[PDB]
Design a protein around this ligand. Structure first.
Ligand SMILES: *[C@@H]1O[C@H](CO)[C@@H](O[C@@H]2O[C@H](CO)[C@@H](O)[C@H](O)[C@H]2NC(C)=O)[C@H](O)[C@H]1NC(C)=O
Ligand SMILES: *[C@@H]1O[C@H](CO)[C@@H](O[C@@H]2O[C@H](CO)[C@@H](O)[C@H](O)[C@H]2NC(C)=O)[C@H](O)[C@H]1NC(C)=O
Ligand SMILES: C/C(=C\CNc1ncnc2[nH]cnc12)CO
Ligand SMILES: C/C(=C\CNc1ncnc2[nH]cnc12)CO
Lengths: 540, 540
């Protein structure tokens, strides 16, 4: 026949072929590799997006890495010695604008570290899923939880109520509890705990949250900025025309002064030149490219858009350059000059700490992690089992037990390595749609991830206007779940709308879920009471 | 039979009864009055909401009404005479925080004027609709266009790119053009210009915009504020713990100073005490009341909630008092002391100006008004005609011509009196659902509006935490249109998502529409080109 056919048959007739039940599932070797390659092309974008989002979280280092600065910027701190000249001792404000150089270097190092951590976690998760449960699924850090971890639990540059290490501890404990409950089979009861409309609309809320994040400044293509009256208006003015804000003390005559201890914000206000930022238009070009590649049903759209924007952004003397002419820019260009490197985890490894188990926000974050993971994992796993045609009449696909256990173990390992919890990817559908049916798909994707590493230097130079449209379009894809809501029934409509609008506005998933559940319960209280009272017997 | 029956028969057998075709439509006198009363109860909330929203727009008066102020607040300007003491000449900054007293008095007077203007415009529109076209519909200022006029075209306290008078001129010209195009039957040709997904999702976008407005500080119940990092987080701290922001010039060492000419913002940042403002909880109580009244299908829910919140807020020495102990509070309490008054429009009457016809934003606002009015009026009028069973097979209900003409004339009259465009209300369905079929419903609603006036003093004391949930729930009701989108087709999904997310984030309807249409057109260029080229003959 053909060498492809000899290879297929030889693998099919081997012990390893029987291990994964190749013959019984009607595919031998080459369908598996094609499915794996398609899956990797579909979901490679995590490699950049997750690293960027987690790097913006501030990393493991604190004010201790802020160097003392001079009184005048023109004098370097080492030479800051003279009359009326002194050194400023770093404070909390060193972490924020204007950022201390030491913190910037720490942040870049943590960015590299997190890239490597993501790659390793995804590889190990894929291997475990492929081997223990023997299914053709792919695992990697979740998009929905990335931003919740980076911008809400920890905050921008560690401005949140939970320290990074305690956040990793929370993720670890959540993974352990998930493994426990999956083992003892209470999972269905907890999944039924949440009301239907909140469960349906939480995904749309998270999609809107990601879309909003993609429209900010230090996360995406700009186009949204501060306004003194409406608090949000049309950004995308040139970077040279952006200024910061500070808190002041008003009065009853018109005087104003700066409030000591004001937490200065970044460049968020535009003074002139709206809709003139070249980075915004480059991001728009990338967005349109990804949109076409999606509409024509071409796999790997987001990678093509990201790569085009990044390649354009690698030139050195442009307005959209990823290497601006300063010290940090020169260091970044130096690193990017070497194409391949083997970076080694140094700080994020084993960075757990159980100090903050007392704080309420700790348990809030843990419970939010737990519920999001339970619901999404169960739903996506059952959907993919349906897509592969493994579901029997009773509704189970045999190997569900070990699939859930493997997902929980992967979550725990990701927690240990220092990344947001890992999950199964809907992108795996592509592999199923290509004919792959056994665990070789997962191992192929794992090998492709292992190939991805060795390229840390190139993946470290992704600007926000490259991340951008990927996040926006992930939100677009996630929004499709709104249809399952009966919008004509107020008792079901109101909680869903609250859930959708609270997440992107309060900028926090937990508050959206809490508001939705509270509104649902308050609305249904009368029905609960009447039903229970008729059950008692006073009413009919 | 019964006096009700004699009255019914006597009216039915009279000339006036034949004028509205009473017998032909199977209702004589009392079904009409019941339908009118139900309609008025359903849609009375406009009386407060429209007045508040348009009053926040700043009115017709400019910095010329800012009085000169003293150097120290403890000295009144009249006595501001002494060493090192002087008078500050008002500039633009007088209009904003800290607001000059004269502008506050002007704003209150404009609020009263706008209340009376809304009442008169709604009355005249209802009368014209009921008489010329002879249908049981109700007219009043639109909710969606209210906020677009008040917060986007003109801006908060006249901070927009269009002067209030020129905005009224734009509304006038838009109404005239609508009348012209409707007269010639060319309306349906324009109505097909907008793509389907944009038309479908614009209503959901406007609903989200209203919901966002209802969650702000000077428009609703708070709960959304400013944050240096995420730009939006969880507000509803006590008013005593809110501070303002100002622009600042940073450096490369950590120094900061104020920027001359900074446009100070209102109290938007919370320093401590989150989720502790009593006004927020009172608004939540009103929201829950309205939600119950809606779920149980009780007419007049929003009025009951507004009235409860206002009645609680009318007390004098509480944290949620609508009369705080100052000069303006005392004046407002003085006015509210007299229950009934006959206020006469003094400024907003005949306030047109055609100076700015050159500006592009003028035409942007005009076209946005025109398209919103065209689409909404056509759709709602046809839906209400269907609901009453007047539609024939061909799809017309006879009196459509004069209905559209009456709506256009009402828009023009509203423009003359100084309010946002007037439209037909979906709430009229209630009157139809009760059995009303003729023009007596409109005249009854007009009489009820005429009754509403004479109560300007009471309607003038509505706080934001009373307006609040009404806006939020109007957004909830509007959101129901998302279902008509095929979320699985990207070429139709992406433009709709862009339209939905751009309106509430950029805080402008026109930009959302422009973005949606642009994305739609750019997405389909390949299809248009291929189709036209195959039409030419090169391809097959
Ligand atoms: C940081 O450097 C700035 C200059 O870039 C210093 O600005 C001082 O304050 C204002 C603004 O320039 C002027 O009136 C002074 O003359 C400036 N002095 C100097 C030496 O530039 C600022 O003082 C420096 N930081 C601190 C803490 O002083
Ligand atoms: C406006 O009134 C205030 C008192 O309410 C005056 O006091 C100023 O207060 C600010 C901040 O507390 C200080 O920075 C100023 O030095 C104070 N000025 C004086 C003269 O004491 C304030 O001065 C008044 N406005 C102006 C322009 O003087
Ligand atoms: C509720 C959770 C999403 C978590 N992340 C993911 N969950 C499942 N598959 C994916 N593909 C990309 N990201 C994901 C839905 O937003
Ligand atoms: C597109 C337009 C709405 C304009 N306003 C209204 N249009 C029609 N009926 C109403 N009832 C209350 N407000 C309205 C839809 O938001």
């Amino acid at each position: 026949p053909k060498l492809l056919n000899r290879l297929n048959t030889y693998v099919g007739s081997s012990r390893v072929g029987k291990r994964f039940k190749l013959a019984e599932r009607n595919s031998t070797f080459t369908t598996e590799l094609r499915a794996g390659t398609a899956t990797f092309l579909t979901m490679a974008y995590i490699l950049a997006v997750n690293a960027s989002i987690l790097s913006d979280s501030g990393g493991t280092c604190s004010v201790s890495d802020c160097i003392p600065l001079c009184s005048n910027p023109a004098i370097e701190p080492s030479q800051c010695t003279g009359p009326g000249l002194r050194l400023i001792q770093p404070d909390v404000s060193c972490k924020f604008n204007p950022v201390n150089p030491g913190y910037a270097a720490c942040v870049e190092e943590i960015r590299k570290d997190l890239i490597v951590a993501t790659v390793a976690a995804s590889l190990i998760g894929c291997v475990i899923m492929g081997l223990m449960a023997n299914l053709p699924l792919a695992l990697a850090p979740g998009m929905g939880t990335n931003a919740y971890f980076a911008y809400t639990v920890v905050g921008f540059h560690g401005s949140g109520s939970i320290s990074y290490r305690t956040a990793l501890a929370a993720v670890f404990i959540e993974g352990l509890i998930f493994l426990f409950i999956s083992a003892i089979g209470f999972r269905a009861k907890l999944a039924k705990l949440v009301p239907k409309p909140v469960r349906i609309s939480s995904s749309a809320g998270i999609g809107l949250f990601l879309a909003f994040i993609g429209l900010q400044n230090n996360q995406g293509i700009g186009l949204v900025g501060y306004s003194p009256s409406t608090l949000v208006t049309l950004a995308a003015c040139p970077a040279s025309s952006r200024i910061s804000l500070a808190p002041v003390i008003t009065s009853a005559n018109g005087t104003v002064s700066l409030l000591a201890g004001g937490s200065v914000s970044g460049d968020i206000m535009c003074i002139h030149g709206r809709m003139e930022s070249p980075t915004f238009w480059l991001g728009i070009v990338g967005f349109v490219i990804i949109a076409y590649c999606l509409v024509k049903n071409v796999k790997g759209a987001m990678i093509y858009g990201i790569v085009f924007v990044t390649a354009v952004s690698w030139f050195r003397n442009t307005e959209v350059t990823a290497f601006p002419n300063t010290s940090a820019g020169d260091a970044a260009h130096d690193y990017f000059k070497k194409i391949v490197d083997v970076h080694v985890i140094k700080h994020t490894a084993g960075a757990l700490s159980f100090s903050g188990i007392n704080k309420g926000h700790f348990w809030e974050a843990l419970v939010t992690f737990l519920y999001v993971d339970i619901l999404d994992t169960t739903g996506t796993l059952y959907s993919m089992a349906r897509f592969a045609g493994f579901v029997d009449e009773k509704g189970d696909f045999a190997g569900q037990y070990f699939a859930f256990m493997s997902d929980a173990s992967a979550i725990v390992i990701g927690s240990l390595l220092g990344t947001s919890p890992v999950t199964v990817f809907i992108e795996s559908s592509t592999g199923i749609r290509e004919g792959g049916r056994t665990g070789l798909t997962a191992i192929t994707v794992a090998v492709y991830f292992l190939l991805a590493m060795f390229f840390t230097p190139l993946l470290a130079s992704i600007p926000a206007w490259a991340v951008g449209p990927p996040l926006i379009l992930v939100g677009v894809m996630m929004m499709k779940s709104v249809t399952e809501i009966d919008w004509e029934d107020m008792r079901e409509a109101i909680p869903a709308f609250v859930t959708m609008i609270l997440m992107p506005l309060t900028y926090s998933v937990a508050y959206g879920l809490i508001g939705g559940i509270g509104s649902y319960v308050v609305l249904h209280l009368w029905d609960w009471g009447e039903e229970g009272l008729v059950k008692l017997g006073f009413l009919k």
